[PDB]
Amino acid sequence: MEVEKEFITDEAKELLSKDKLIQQAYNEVKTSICSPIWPATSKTFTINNTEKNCNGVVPIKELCYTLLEDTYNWYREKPIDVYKEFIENSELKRVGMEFETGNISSAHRSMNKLLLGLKHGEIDLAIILMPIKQLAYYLTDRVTNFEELEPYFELTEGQPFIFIGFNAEAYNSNVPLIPKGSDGMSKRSIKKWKDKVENK
Amino acid sequence: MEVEKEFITDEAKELLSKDKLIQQAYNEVKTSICSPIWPATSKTFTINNTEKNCNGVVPIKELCYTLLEDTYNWYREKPIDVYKEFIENSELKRVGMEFETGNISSAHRSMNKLLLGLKHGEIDLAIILMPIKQLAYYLTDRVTNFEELEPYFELTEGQPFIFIGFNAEAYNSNVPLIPKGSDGMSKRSIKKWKDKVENK
Predict the structure, then answer these.
(1) Looking at chain A, which terminus has fewer C-beta neighbours within 10 angstroms, N or C?
(2) Residues of B annotated in the binding site for Mg(2+), as ranges?
(3) Catalytic annotation on A157?
């Protein structure tokens, strides 16, 4: 998968350029979102482009969260979806991230949830992942996209915040469809997918 | 109807205490939300309390917006629901307001929409109206409430923002139910209701 667009506030830029461990959490997020491949036998992520809204997006989020959890030791649910916690220079630091699979109103609620966590000092950096419009077009109906929330990234200024817009590497009607729903893929299937991603 | 809870940022407080015409727009909003009465023959607002979620809320919003429009010369749709525009000391000033009838995610999107309008200088003050939890309990299923959005009022600090939580004056199972939906009441019915509210 590719990171095609990215928005980083000035405060996140300063924080990344001076905090190694925060820079690391961010690197792990970028890697977990670039790593998905499809089909599982492949080394690129190709999305089936037969019709609008034909693919699910939840399986992608589950895969992403699983890599962070299993490979990178991130925790799930703080109610921030996933976060990394660690001591650095005698201080506990937390990074929070959410992968948006809901509609635009959902994305607003998610952004504000992180913004409040930041204001209260519960997290030191917030990251949101969203598919860009081009990809979202072939993803399930509900799902919002990076460009739709973009006019509002400005509301995070003054706080360490990063928005990442991902895209598939290719679009073809010759690969299978990604299943829809929370149960689109079992944990056994996500873990098998994760292994292929990691060559195991 | 009663204004039972209210949140005003420090910046709204300063602005109200030094800008007469903004103070006036605010007074007109408070009056339009206190004015609803039910049934139409009554002088208080009594809400039917037979079951949870039995009453509609959209008719109340339509009535409120109609008083502001017809009696107070506010405009509808700028896409801020209603706003008042006026020249004061050789400057164009705008006040924007939204009456929340959607769910909590909706309320977040609405708050952010106003927050961005404020940052860009498109409006000078933002106001949001929401029913308090006690009332919301007897309102339609979708509708969010003041207390649910409350933890987030803090995100508006630094900007002129006001949140108003309204309540019915009485709860009784002997009055009729307020119809649900956008078409719950025709414009003829809302205007007839408005006249009773205004004694005409």
Answers:
(1) C
(2) 77, 81, 98-99
(3) no
Q: Which residues of B153-186 are buried (b: 16+ CB within 10 A; e: fewer)?
A: bebbeebbbbbbbbbbbebeeebebbebeeebbe
Local structure of A12: helix, strand or coil:
helix
Any idea of the CA torsion for A61, A62, A65, A66, to the nearest 10 degrees? -150
3-state class of A34 per DSSP?
helix
Separation between Cα atoms, residue B172 and residue B50, nearest integer Å? 8
- Bridge-based pairing of strands B161-167 and B2-8 is antiparallel
Q: Which residues of A touch B115 (CB under 8 A)?
A: 155
Question: Which residues of B line the annotated binding site?
Answer: 77, 81, 98-99
DSSP state, residue B70:
H
Q: How many CA atoms lie within 13 A of B183 on its CB side?
A: 0
Say how far apart CA B28 and CA B34 lie, in whole Å.
10
Out of 3.40.50.300, 3.40.91.20, 3.40.50.1980, 3.40.190.10, select the CATH number for domain A1-200. 3.40.91.20
Selected catalytic residue, list B85, B100, B122, B150: B100
Contact, B46 vs B168, CB < 8 A?
yes
Backbone angles phi, psi at A168, to 5 degrees: -80, 155
Are residues B63 and B181 in contact, defined by beta-carbon separation less than 8 angstroms? no
Q: Which amino acid is at B127?
A: I
Experimental determination approach used: X-ray
Resolution of this entry, Å: 2.0
State the Cα–Cα distance between residues A109 and B103, nearest whole angstrom: 11
Looking at beta carbons, which residues of chain B come within 8 Å of A154? 116, 119
Quick one: tokens of B54?
A: 């039995």
Residues 6+ apart with CB under 8 A from A187: none
